[PDB]
A paper describes a structure:
BlaC is a class A serine β‐lactamase found in Mycobacterium tuberculosis (Wang et al., 2006). The enzymes in this class utilize an active site serine (Ser70) to perform a nucleophilic attack on β‐lactam rings, forming a covalent acyl‐enzyme intermediate that is subsequently hydrolyzed (Fisher & Mobashery, 2009; Strynadka et al., 1992). BlaC can efficiently hydrolyze penicillin antibiotics but has low activity against later‐generation oxyimino‐cephalosporins, such as ceftazidime, due to their bulky C7β aminothiazole‐oxyimino side chain (Sun et al., 2023; Wang et al., 2006). We analyzed the structural changes in mutants of the β‐lactamase BlaC from Mycobacterium tuberculosis obtained via directed evolution for increased ceftazidime hydrolysis activity.
At 37°C, two variants were found that were further evolved, yielding P167S/D240G/D172A/S104G/H184R (PDDSH) and P167S/D240G/I105F/H184R (PDIH) in G3, respectively. The crystal structures of BlaC variants PD, PDDS, and PDDSH were solved at 1.3, 1.6, and 1.4 Å resolution, respectively. While the refinement statistics for the PD and PDDS structures are within the expected values for the resolution (Rfree of 18 and 17, respectively), the PDDSH dataset suffers from translational non‐crystallographic symmetry, resulting in a higher Rfree value of 25. As a consequence, the chain between residues 167 and 172 is only partially ordered, indicating mobility in this region of the Ω‐loop. In the BlaC variant PDDSH (purple in Figure 3a), the Ω‐loop residues 165–172 are disordered, indicating still more conformational flexibility. In this variant, the peptide bond between Gly104 and Ile105 is flipped, and the gatekeeper loop moves 2.5 Å compared to the PD and PDDS variants, enlarging the active site. Mutation H184R occurred twice, in different branches of the directed evolution experiments and in both cases causes an increase in the melting temperature, suggesting, therefore, that this mutation is generally stabilizing. An Arg at position 184 could potentially form salt bridges with Glu59 and Asp63 and a cation‐π interaction with Tyr48. The mutants selected at 37°C display more than 15‐fold increased resistance compared to PD and over 120‐fold compared to WT. For one branch of the directed evolution experiment, we managed to obtain crystal structures of the successive mutants, PD, PDDS, and PDDSH, showing the opening and increasing disorder of the Ω‐loop in an otherwise defined protein structure, suggesting minor structural changes.
Numbering used by the authors: 29 to 83, 86 to 145, 145A, 145B, 145C, 145D, 146 to 164, 174 to 238, ...
């Protein structure tokens, strides 16, 4: 009957929706198109930060990166302000997550190094976490795609599991906790007394994603990955944040 609710959302919003909530001691898994591929959009920036954290000592965060106008990618709300001054790796991580800053992500990819401007490094990092599905590359094409299951299991490991040592884990978690882009997505579907940390993605073809870790009022954590597109409507199909909020509401109803 929950499957029917998500299918109803697909009909109303004229969209493809993907959900995955890993099973825990207290709840069953929630899965809907959990093994179909969706575009990462900017959701890749959360594991990107994890990769950079994982492969470097903590002192690396203090490395100043200088860059030019030619390195600017997308809106870059933070990096647009620091062409003259540069930004530390830690500032870039912050901006990449909290503002989905595209220049920051570009530079963190470069910091990983390797072929494809760091995309091979990124993908290889995911492989190390047991994700054999996702890929980041240099509408239906498989480039730059993940699955709701794949990304949710990655996020679980990063935030709640032991993929990262405690100090690095806490940095990633805090940046996600202070995200500025996610108020109308998973956050909007969960009651106020639930804690939410998250990272968004948005694109053409009506693409809208949100990956989150939520905590019940009792302090019990769950991982929620919601992904959507409207590729049938072409490049100019509007992304629907409300779809993600309503999917999130269904999830919150199960977890309550």
């Amino acid at each position: 009957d929950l499957a029917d609710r998500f299918a109803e959302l697909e009909r109303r919003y004229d969209a493809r929706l993907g959900v995955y909530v890993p099973a825990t001691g207290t709840t069953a898994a929630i899965e809907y198109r959990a093994d179909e591929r969706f575009a990462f959009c900017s959701t890749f920036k959360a594991p990107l930060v994890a990769a950079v954290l994982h492969q470097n000592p903590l002192t690396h965060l203090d490395k100043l990166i200088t860059y030019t106008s030619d390195d600017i990618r997308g809106i870059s709300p933070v990096a647009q302000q620091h062409v003259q001054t540069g930004m530390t790796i830690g500032q870039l991580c912050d901006a990449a997550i909290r503002y989905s800053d595209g220049t920051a992500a570009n530079l963190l990819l470069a910091d990983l190094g390797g072929p494809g401007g760091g995309t091979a490094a990124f993908t290889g990092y995911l492989r190390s976490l047991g994700d054999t599905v996702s890929r980041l590359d240099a509408p239906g094409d498989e480039r730059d795609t993940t699955t709701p299951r794949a990304i949710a299991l990655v996020l679980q490991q990063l935030v709640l599991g032991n993929a990262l040592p405690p100090d690095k884990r806490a940095l990633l978690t805090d940046w996600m906790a202070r995200n500025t882009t996610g108020a109308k997505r998973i956050r909007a579907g969960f009651p106020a007394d639930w804690k939410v940390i998250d990272k968004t993605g948005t694109g053409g073809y009506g693409r809208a994603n949100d990956i989150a870790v939520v905590w019940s009022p009792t302090g019990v954590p769950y991982v929620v990955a919601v992904m959507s597109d409207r590729a049938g409507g072409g490049y100019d199909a509007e992304p629907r944040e409300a779809l993600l909020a309503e999917a999130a509401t269904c999830v919150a109803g199960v977890l309550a």
